[PDB]
């Protein structure tokens, strides 16, 4: 799980 | 804990720990230090059980295939030779010990599998794996058998396997990557189904393991066998009038062995590094140490230059490296060990009937690949996870976008990288490997 802004 | 002030090495039971002994003595009357050597059983497995609460051999010896798991799981200390170390050895086997840019063993040996034949029994070795069924008639009407070999590790039925199939793994984007069919293939599968082939005919017999094929070759029992360098010692004590060969060609193709560089790492909860370090650059890595080694079982083509030189004219390394330029060299990725688990449990299931060969393969297949595409995921989400810069940040968001799988939260852009197809995280890494971030 990627999660960037 | 491990013991100060002292060395303790671990080795396999094949190879020659009483000639190592010997560099210990030598070791010890120089510089007081007594070295302990040690072969326990299962001593790759053993290893990473020990050193990961602190204990185990202040060296292990293994093939380099190993190392990159225990260098990932921080079992190993990153050793520092100096660039007039370095020169003494060949380059080739300085990569195969190299894991994520840092070096963690010292490459010690080049082994190869080839094709030992008794020159009494068979004057003239089959060049081809086909014609070994009729060899075996006509050895079995004289008491004979044409070949016996260990059936119970994949290391040895891998290269009739990759004959026809190929290489099982592929370098791409900084990193080595088993291949989408490098075990599922037509021609992997026409390999292992001739090895079962040759077990249905009583050519051979599925329980065959390394003892046996050893004591049958040993004894004159069976015109041939396959074996390492490490092997060549516990023949010549036999007297056995023997050769050392190209291994037999499967479809026209050449068997391709996995080629292992014997190497020797420093486990890093050591507190003897240093006297590590001396013992392996200046007492082994010489023309007496590996000498020592040698004349109690044969290292192969060793990594040191100047002694290698003076081993070059042996005509059973000339084979050894002859199988080793027909082979793949192996990874060091920490899927080692699953694939090794899969390709065994493939073999002895279609030996025994348990699987048939497509099944068998179709499975070693997803079980290898499933298991180091994970840790590649797993490695490319954690260099994901620390990027920041935006640049870079926008053209993994544009490459995601493309494809519609992600989703958007109040505050974060959200993507899987087990919902992307295989071609998109090639992409991912291509790109990365261009960012100049690591
Ligand atoms: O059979 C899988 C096994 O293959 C290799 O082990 C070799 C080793 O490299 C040789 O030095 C010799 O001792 O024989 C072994 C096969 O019995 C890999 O190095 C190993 O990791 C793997 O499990």
Redesign the pocket.
Request: aromatic share 30%.
């Given at each position: 799980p990627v999660a960037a802004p | 804990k491990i013991e100060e002030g002292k060395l303790v090495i671990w080795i396999?039971g094949?190879?020659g720990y009483n000639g190592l002994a010997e560099v210990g003595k030598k070791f010890e009357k120089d510089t007081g230090i007594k070295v302990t050597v040690e072969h326990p059983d299962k001593l790759?497995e053993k290893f990473p059980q020990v050193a990961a609460t602190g204990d185990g051999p202040d060296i292990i010896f293994?093939?380099?295939?190993?190392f990159g798991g225990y260098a990932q799981s921080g079992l190993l200390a990153e050793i520092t030779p100096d660039k007039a170390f370095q020169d003494k050895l060949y380059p080739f086997t300085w990569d195969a010990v190299r894991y994520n840019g840092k070096l963690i063993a010292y490459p010690i040996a080049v082994?190869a599998l080839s094709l030992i034949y008794n020159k009494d029994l068979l004057p003239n070795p089959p060049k081809t794996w086909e014609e070994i069924p009729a060899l075996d008639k006509e050895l079995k009407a004289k008491g004979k058998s044409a070949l016996m070999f260990?059936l119970?590790?994949?290391?040895?039925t891998?290269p009739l396997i990759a004959a026809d199939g190929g290489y099982a793994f592929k370098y791409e984007n900084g990193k080595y990557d088993i291949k989408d069919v490098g075990v599922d293939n037509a021609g992997a599968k026409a390999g292992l189904t001739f090895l079962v082939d040759l077990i249905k005919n009583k050519h051979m017999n599925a329980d065959t393991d390394?003892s046996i094929a050893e004591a049958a070759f040993n004894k004159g029992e069976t015109a041939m066998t396959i074996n390492?360098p490490?092997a060549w010692s516990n023949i010549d004590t036999s007297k056995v009038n023997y050769g050392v060969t190209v291994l037999p060609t499967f479809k026209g193709q050449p068997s391709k062995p996995?080629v292992?560089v014997?190497s020797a790492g420093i486990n890093a909860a050591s507190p003897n590094k240093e006297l590590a370090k001396e013992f392996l650059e200046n007492y082994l890595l010489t023309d007496e140490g590996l000498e020592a080694v040698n004349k109690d079982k044969p290292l192969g083509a060793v990594a040191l230059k100047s002694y290698e030189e003076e081993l070059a004219k042996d005509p059973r390394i000339a084979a050894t490296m002859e199988n080793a330029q027909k082979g793949e060299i192996?990874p060091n990725i920490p899927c080692?060990?699953a694939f090794?688990?899969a390709?065994?449990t493939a073999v002895i299931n279609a030996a025994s009937g348990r699987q048939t060969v497509d099944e068998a393969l179709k499975d070693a297949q997803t079980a290898a690949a499933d298991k180091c595409y994970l840790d590649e995921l797993v490695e490319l989400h954690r260099r994901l996870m620390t990027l920041r810069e935006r640049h870079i940040l926008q053209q993994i968001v544009n490459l995601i976008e493309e494809t519609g799988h992600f989703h958007i939260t109040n505050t974060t852009f959200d993507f899987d990288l087990c919902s992307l197809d295989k071609t998109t995280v090639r992409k991912l890494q291509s790109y990365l490997e261009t960012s100049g971030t690591s």
């Open positions: - | 396999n094949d190879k790759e293994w093939a380099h295939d190993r082994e260990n119970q590790e994949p290391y040895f891998w390394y390492g490490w996995f292992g014997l192996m080692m060990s090794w688990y390709v065994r």
